Ligand binder design. Sequence first.
Ligand SMILES: N=C(N)c1ccc(CNC(=O)[C@@H]2CCCN2C(=O)CNC2CCCC2)cc1
Ligand SMILES: [Ca+2]
Length: 223
Amino acid sequence: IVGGYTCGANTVPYQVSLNSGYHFCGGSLINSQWVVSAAHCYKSGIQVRLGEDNINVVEGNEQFISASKSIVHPSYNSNTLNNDIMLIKLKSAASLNSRVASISLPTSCASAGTQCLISGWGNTKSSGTSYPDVLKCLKAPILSDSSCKSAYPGQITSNMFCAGYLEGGKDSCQGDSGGPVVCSGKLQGIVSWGSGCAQKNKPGVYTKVCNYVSWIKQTIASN
Ligand SMILES: N=C(N)c1ccc(CNC(=O)[C@@H]2CCCN2C(=O)CNC2CCCC2)cc1
Ligand SMILES: [Ca+2]
């Protein structure tokens, strides 16, 4: 997160860290046994880290649980990043508490101008690299369909939206991938892609979760 702020410990209790001996992606807890993340975050050997603030110190409240299943959308395309969504089943259920909590799926899609909360342990620099120890936060609005397509012509599918700031300076970045965009208490986005980070006229692009609620339920119910 570039241009954001320190969230404060466990203020984003649905935020998880995907760990393979290092933080590599975020995700969102949607019930005691399932996480939503990005298909481009897929790999073998994922450990889901719940309850985290400082990812480099065991502070208390952490739950580390291996993934038992990682289910990438069968229509994911790694070139266009269409259908950039993955479900992870935990090997054991998480113990839910004030520090480890699920986030609701949407009942409907959000509209342009909706303010959302984006969070993660990704890069904090728009030029070069700096990676934080504690969780960072950014409030960002959803942009219009047309502004999104005018920024990234021929690259925005019906399964994507843009959010952020065209003037630059405030954005998600590498290492925030797979993490949440939460609007009015609902998970509406997944951190997916963009050109650079926090660059003028290049907002962030997010997977449109409302298009996947039925797929998520249907897939969890059969797994
Ligand atoms: N500016 C952001 N909001 C942002 C940008 C990138 C990420 C992480 N995702 C990525 O790095 C993904 C994975 C595959 C390549 N990719 C892309 O973002 C590549 N950038 C595209 C290429 C042409 C137009 C812009 C996360 C956030
Ligand atoms: Ca920790």
